[PDB]
Amino acid sequence: TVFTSWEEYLDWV
Amino acid sequence: TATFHRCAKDPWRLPGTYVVVLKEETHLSQSERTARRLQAQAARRGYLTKILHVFHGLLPGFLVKMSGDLLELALKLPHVDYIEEDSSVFAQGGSLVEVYLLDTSIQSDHREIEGRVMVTDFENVPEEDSKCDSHGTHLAGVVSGRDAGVAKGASMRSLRVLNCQGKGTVSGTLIGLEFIRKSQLVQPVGPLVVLLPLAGGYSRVLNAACQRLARAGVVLVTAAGNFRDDACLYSPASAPEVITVGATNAQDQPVTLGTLGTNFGRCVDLFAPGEDIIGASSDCSTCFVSQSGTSQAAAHVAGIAAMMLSAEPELTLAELRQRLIHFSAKDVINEAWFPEDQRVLTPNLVAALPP
Amino acid sequence: CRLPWNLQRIGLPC
Ligand SMILES: [Ca+2]
């Protein structure tokens, strides 16, 4: 999975 | 007497191209005269030879594209130590320290590593048989990235030795390591941490070069390999004066990558996080992706060694290795994942920064 | 303090 922003990764994990 | 060597892993062999290694104290003029002697003796026997490159800095030698029929004769030349047939290699704080990355092309405009990385004009990749920059960008991200980076304050210099398919050559890496040495002699800087997130089969020449560069005061960090095998059968991993890094997961268990996984043995120095490593994705300028392998593991150690050397620049290579070991989490990895006889030989150490 | 497991494990402060 590729996250377009750092914040996107944080909501996921 | 001179000896001939070729990669034991047959698919990885690259015939027709040879690295002629000469005796330690051979001068550039002597090496050039030897390549011309070889070219003249071959032409006299009706053979077509091309001198691709002449080595000087680390090892006295030259690269030659020629028939194998000439090896017995090439072994008879003066100053010759050994001749190695070219083989393939595959992809697997910190302010006053420069990190050299020998890898694929990198996406330097990425908002994570923008400004931190200097893309050198160096390129030496074999022909292929976003995704092309993928491997290098992530490792540059792990080493110095703005959000997910280990040594955020560290600056990087990138060299291209791996193609879009993540493939390189022994000679390509040899020319690369020689370029670092020349750059250092032309404009000296401070402590250097060279990251090699690549591996091929055991190579006499690649190890010899890694030993000279190490003896020259340069720190060399490498991947153990993703072959679930003894790391002593792979180069540069088998080079003793190098920091060989294996990968472990979140559950202090060695990383499994399909049917394979991290390497082990008496050649591995320590281990570091290698499963689910978040870093820079070359897809877009702000993009992030999770990658795995002994490359990501080595990238953590490259970050730790940068921070450690920035804080204590006078440290000798032997002293730094003691610091890496002393600060590592001890007896945490599940030994039972490795083959029975490798357990006593494999060091149960997971890389960590001082508290 | 939302630090990735790897950065947490190697002992980086968040
Ligand atoms: Ca070692």
HEC-encoded secondary structure of chain C? CCCCHHHHHCCCCC
What does the alpha-carbon distance between residue B81 and residue B187 come to, in Å, rounded to a whole number? 31
Q: How many CB atoms lie within 10 A of CB B352?
A: 20
B123 touches chain A (CB under 8 A): no
Interface test with C, best of B300, B326, B330, B349 (most C CBs within 10 A): B300
Count of alpha carbons within 13 Å of B274, Cβ hemisphere only? 31
Using left for φ > 0, alpha for ψ between -120 and 50, and beta otherwise, residue B223 falls in beta
Gyration radius of chain B over CA positions: 20
Tell me if B308 sits within 8 A of B324, measured CB to CB: yes
A→C contacts (Cβ < 8 Å), by residue, are 10, 13
Closest by Cα among B14, B60, B44, B167 to B104? B167
**Residue in this structure with the two tokens 């990251």, named with its chain if needed:** B195
Pick the CATH number of B92-350 from 3.40.50.200, 3.30.830.10, 1.25.40.10, 3.20.20.70: 3.40.50.200
Of the candidates B296, B305, B242, B243, the one whose C-alpha atom is nearest the C-alpha of residue B273 is B296
Q: Which of B235, B230, B228 is nearest to B200 (CA)?
A: B235
Residue with tokens 């290698």: B274
Does A2 contact B at CB distance below 8 Å?
yes
Other CB atoms within 10 Å distance of the CB of residue A9: 21
Report CB contact under 8 Å: A3, B281.
yes
Q: Choose the CATH number for B3-87 among 1.10.3720.10, 3.40.190.10, 3.30.465.10, 3.30.70.80.
A: 3.30.70.80
- Kindly state the tokens that stand for A5: 């922003």
Tell me whether A12 touches chain B (CB under 8 Å): no
Separation CA B185–CA B352 (nearest Å)? 32
Instruction: Give the minimum alpha-carbon distance from C5 to chain A in angstroms, rounded to a whole number.
Output: 10
**Rg for chain C, CA atoms, rounded:** 6
| Close Cβ partners of B83 (under 8 Å, ≥ 6 residues apart) | B2, B3, B4, B5, B18, B19, B20, B21, B71, B74, B75
Q: Virtual CA dihedral for B322, B323, B325, B331, nearest 10 degrees?
A: 130
Tokens of B330: 């001890």
Three-state SS for B19? strand
Specify whether the backbone of B85 is left (phi greater than 0), alpha (psi in -120 to 50) or beta.
Answer: beta
Q: Do C10 and B278 touch (CB under 8 A)?
A: no
Residue B115: in which H helix or E strand, if any? none
| Alpha carbons B105 and B112: distance in angstroms, whole number | 16
Counting every residue written for chain C, the total comes to 14
A1 touches chain B (CB under 8 A): yes
CA atoms within 13 A on the CB side of B111: 10
Cα B300 from Cα B321, distance rounded (Å): 15
d(CA B249, CA B256): 9
Q: Is the Cβ–Cβ distance between B243 and B272 less than 8 Å?
A: no
Contacts of B106 (CB under 8 A, 6+ apart): B113, B117, B119, B133, B136, B137, B140, B158
One-character DSSP codes across B175-200 = HHHHHHHHHHHHS--S-EEEEE-EEE
Residue B241, burial from CB neighbour count under 10 angstroms (0-12, 13-18, 19+) = middle
Q: Which of B141, B156, B154, B155 is nearest to B278 (CA)?
A: B141
CA distances from B301 to B39, B58, B136, B278 (A): 45, 25, 16, 16
C11 touches chain A (CB under 8 A): no
Domain map (residue ranges) of chain B: 3-87, 92-350
| CA nearest to B147, candidates B104, B196, B111, B109 | B111
Phi, psi of B209 (to 5 degrees): -65, -45
Q: What is the DSSP letter of B127?
A: P
Phi, psi of B201 (to 5 degrees): -75, 160
As residues whose CB is below 5 A from the ion ligand 1, the structure lists: B 244, 269
Cβ–Cβ below 8 Å for A3 and B284: no
- For residue B292, give the H/E element and its range: none
Q: Is B150 within 8 Å of B304 (Cβ atoms)?
A: yes
Which ranges of B98-203 would DSSP assign to H, the alpha helix? 134-144, 170-186
Decide if A6 and B287 are in contact by the 8 Å CB cutoff: no
Q: How far is the CA of B266 from the centre of ligand 1 (A)?
A: 8
How far apart CA B273 and CA B259 sit, in angstroms, is: 19
Annotated active-site positions of B, please?
103, 135, 295
Q: Do A4 and B278 touch (CB under 8 A)?
A: no
* Resolution to 1 decimal place, in Å: 2.9
Query: Which of the other chains make 3 or more beta carbon contacts under 8 angstroms with chain B?
Result: A, C
Q: Which residues on adjacent β-strands are paired with residue B103?
A: B160
Chain A residue with CA closest to C3: the answer is A10
Residue among B87, B89, B85, B84 nearest B226 (CA): B89
Which residues of chain A are within 8 Å of residue C2 when distances are taken between CB atoms? Answer: 10, 13
Q: Is the peptide bond before B236 cis (omega within 30 degrees of 0)?
A: yes
Per-state percent for chain A, helix, strand, coil, to nearest 5: 55, 10, 40
Strand B219-223 and strand B329-330: the pairing is unpaired
CB B294 within 8 Å of CB B246: yes
Q: Do domains B3-87 and B92-350 have the same CATH topology?
A: no
C-beta atoms of B148 and C10 within 8 A: no
CA atoms within a 13 Å half-sphere pointing along the CA-CB vector of B6: 12
Place of tokens 């022994």: B170
Distance of alpha carbon B122 from alpha carbon B142, whole angstroms: 22
Backbone angles phi, psi at B289, to 5 degrees: -145, 155
